[PDB]
Scaffold this active site. Structure first.
Site, PDB file in Angstrom:
ATOM      1  N   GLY A 214       2.340   4.498   7.474  1.00 21.69           N
ATOM      2  CA  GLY A 214       2.402   3.245   7.775  1.00 21.69           C
ATOM      3  C   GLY A 214       1.599   2.049   6.885  1.00 21.69           C
ATOM      4  N   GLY A 215       1.495   1.005   7.218  1.00 18.25           N
ATOM      5  CA  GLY A 215       0.815   0.031   6.443  1.00 18.25           C
ATOM      6  C   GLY A 215       1.620  -1.413   6.686  1.00 18.25           C
ATOM      7  N   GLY A 217       1.035  -3.789   8.552  1.00 18.95           N
ATOM      8  CA  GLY A 217       1.018  -4.266  10.187  1.00 18.95           C
ATOM      9  C   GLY A 217       2.139  -3.362  11.024  1.00 18.95           C
ATOM     10  CE  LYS A 218       7.701  -1.743  10.886  1.00 16.91           C
ATOM     11  NZ  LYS A 218       9.327  -1.902  10.811  1.00 16.91           N
ATOM     12  N   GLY A 219       3.400   0.977  11.952  1.00 14.38           N
ATOM     13  CA  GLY A 219       3.286   2.195  12.220  1.00 14.38           C
ATOM     14  C   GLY A 219       1.474   2.455  12.773  1.00 14.38           C
ATOM     15  CD  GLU A 323     -11.042  -0.013   1.720  1.00  9.96           C
ATOM     16  OE1 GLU A 323     -10.750  -0.211   2.763  1.00  9.96           O
ATOM     17  OE2 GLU A 323     -10.180  -0.440   0.840  1.00  9.96           O
ATOM     18  CD  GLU A 336      -8.170   2.327   1.917  1.00  8.75           C
ATOM     19  OE1 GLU A 336      -8.318   1.130   2.204  1.00  8.75           O
ATOM     20  OE2 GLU A 336      -7.165   2.907   1.354  1.00  8.75           O
ATOM     21  CG  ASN A 338      -7.618   0.328  -1.879  1.00  7.86           C
ATOM     22  OD1 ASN A 338      -6.381  -0.059  -2.348  1.00  7.86           O
ATOM     23  ND2 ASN A 338      -7.902   0.238  -0.812  1.00  7.86           N
ATOM     24  NE  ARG A 340      -4.292  -2.193  -3.996  1.00  9.25           N
ATOM     25  CZ  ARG A 340      -5.155  -3.091  -3.669  1.00  9.25           C
ATOM     26  NH1 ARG A 340      -6.064  -3.445  -4.844  1.00  9.25           N
ATOM     27  NH2 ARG A 340      -5.215  -3.622  -2.469  1.00  9.25           N
TER      28      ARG A 340
END
Length: 494
Positions: A214-215, A217-219, A323, A336, A338, A340
């Protein structure tokens, strides 16, 4: 007087313990990322080679950005036209980036954030064609996988984690980066409404139903009761089909903290303090702070240590963020990592005196962490010394220089406009045409805030900001934000 500059990137690599010469870089991105990448690397280039164009840059330009005349284009040393339309046709097209990198050819690629910067196939395909990547290697991104995997790793490493469909799952952990067996991974997912409700009652409501793929705003779906769990759980399946699904307890209004990691290609990893990004407006980081003072230094340091442990374990390289979730009481949970650099990195740069994109470059050329002048100075060592540095127990534990406040801003030819303020001299910003960011430095948090409010007020004069930056001023001025109260509930009734 001794000369600290060098002839070419060639001599630098040789004299600084690197094992690869990168003097041509392709930037798979546009807007502020492109600009920032170049501005940072050139500042460093001028200091080290007394030549701002020592490291050549090649950018990708779409028919859109070209007609609009983006600042980054004329800024680059070379630019290659690519198909317009959605990024899968350009900046996000891994097969296209690798292709261009090969033909020029460049010795490395920088993707910054957004687009393909989090796609493991980029560093993988680039490595396969002898092209460096200014970011983590594919093996490290894979060894980290999605939230499901990375969380299992977090637990295997004994870092607290929010209750979820995979709580308790761990792996049996000289070299060799951690791995999560497909069978253990499958234990954290919920295949149907049957075991979904099963896990749900165990995590308790309200909770989040999320697709691993997901990601954007989806899933994702928030369920507050068993009655709606089924529909919602099927809604996710319909949105991101085939995707592994997992559940996770909903954080009850807590603080969001981040640790800035920086690792070389030799197992060395350090923390560059952190950022506090609790103030958010509908899944958007509105106001950010550095360093994070809300939590006790003793507790934040422990979060740094776990962040470093996790990074070391997956064999991370370059910069990335870990995070966390800090609770009013004293508890914290890994969220999580990140893989990057994030757009709000200037904060850290400003309080730790570390030029990140220049650091990413040097690390990609294979320079050990202790040979990076910015870090040596951070640790109170000699600028150009060669002596090893004990990061674990340093003889001069680094200290953050001042306080930074960063705000995200919005409007009422060019893609990135540089913002300058006659009012405050410790504030700088930019604007991408939509959104932008302002960065304010201060001797202490109070001073950093005052400066931001004056720069923001200087902004209000501009027509495009005669309204949009009014709530930020009010927020920064609220007694609640001023005293830095733990609770962030006041944001709602602002």
């Amino acid at each position: 007087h001794r000369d600290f500059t060098v002839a070419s990137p060639a001599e630098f690599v040789t004299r600084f313990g690197g094992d690869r010469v990168i003097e041509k870089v392709l930037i798979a991105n546009n807007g502020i990322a492109a600009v920032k990448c170049m501005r940072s690397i050139r500042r460093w280039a001028y200091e080290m080679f007394r030549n701002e164009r020592a490291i050549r840059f090649v950018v990708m330009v779409t028919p859109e950005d070209l007609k609009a005349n983006a600042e980054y284009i004329k800024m680059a040393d070379h630019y290659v036209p690519v198909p317009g339309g959605p990024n899968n046709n350009n900046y996000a097209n891994v097969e296209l980036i690798v292709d261009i990198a090969k033909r020029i050819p460049v010795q490395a690629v920088w993707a910054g954030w957004g687009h393909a910067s989090e796609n493991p196939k980029l560093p993988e395909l680039l490595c396969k064609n002898g092209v460096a990547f200014l970011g983590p290697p594919s093996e490290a991104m894979w060894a980290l996988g999605d939230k499901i995997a990375s969380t299992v790793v977090a637990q295997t490493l004994q870092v607290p984690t929010l209750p979820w469909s995979g709580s308790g799952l761990t792996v049996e952990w000289q070299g060799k980066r951690i791995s999560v067996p497909e069978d253990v991974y499958d234990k954290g997912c919920v295949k149907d409404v049957d075991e979904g409700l099963e896990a749900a009652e165990r995590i308790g409501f309200p909770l989040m139903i999320k697709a691993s793929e997901g990601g954007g705003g989806k899933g994702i779906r928030k369920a507050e009761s068993a009655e709606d769990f089924p529909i919602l759980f099927r809604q996710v399946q319909s949105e991101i089909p085939g995707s592994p699904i997992f559940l996770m307890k909903l954080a009850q209004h807590a603080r969001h903290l981040e640790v800035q990691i920086l690792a070389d290609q030799y197992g060395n990893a350090v923390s560059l303090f952190g950022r506090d990004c609790s103030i958010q407006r509908r899944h958007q980081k509105i106001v950010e702070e550095a360093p994070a003072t809300i939590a006790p230094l003793a507790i934040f340091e422990f979060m740094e240590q776990c962040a470093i442990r996790l990074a070391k374990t997956v064999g991370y390289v370059s910069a990335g963020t870990v995070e966390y979730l800090y609770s009013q009481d004293g508890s914290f949970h890994f969220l999580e990592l990140n893989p990057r650099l994030q757009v709000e990195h200037p904060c850290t740069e400003m309080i730790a005196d570390v030029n990140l994109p220049a650091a990413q470059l040097q690390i990609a050329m294979g320079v050990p962490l202790h040979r990076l002048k910015d870090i040596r100075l951070l640790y109170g060592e000699s600028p150009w010394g060669v002596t090893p540095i004990s990061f674990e127990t340093p003889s001069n534990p680094p200290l953050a220089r001042g306080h930074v406040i960063a705000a995200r801003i919005t409007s009422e030819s060019g893609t990135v406009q540089e913002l300058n303020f006659r009012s405050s001299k410790n504030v700088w910003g930019y604007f991408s045409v939509q959104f932008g960011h302002c960065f304010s430095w201060g001797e202490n948090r109070e001073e950093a805030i005052s400066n931001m409010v004056v720069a923001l007020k200087e902004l209000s004069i501009r027509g495009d900001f005669r309204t949009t930056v009014e709530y930020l001023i009010n927020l920064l001025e609220t007694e609640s934000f001023q005293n830095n109260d733990i609770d962030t509930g006041w944001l709602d009734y602002l």
